[PDB]
Amino acid sequence: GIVEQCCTSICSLYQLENYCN
Amino acid sequence: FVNQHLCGSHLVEALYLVCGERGFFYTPKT
Numbered sequence: 001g002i003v004e005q006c007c008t009s010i011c012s013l014y015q016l017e018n019y020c021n
Numbered sequence: 022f023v024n025q026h027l028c029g030s031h032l033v034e035a036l037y038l039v040c041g042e043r044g045f046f047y048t049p050k051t
């Protein structure tokens with residue numbers, strides 16, 4: 001989920017956008 | 022865009038900024 005990808009690890013702008021509606 | 026670990030409230034603010042009018046879902050136990 002988002003925590004694992006973007007907080008534990010680092011996310012690109014594109015990966016963060018996967019959590020938009 | 023920043024290349025850093027984004028956690029807690031900072032992560033939520035990043036989604037509010039990136040997603041704009043679309044909105045977003047924050048589901049931490051996923």
Ligand SMILES: [Zn+2]
Nearest residue numbers: 028029030031
């Ligand atoms: Zn802080």
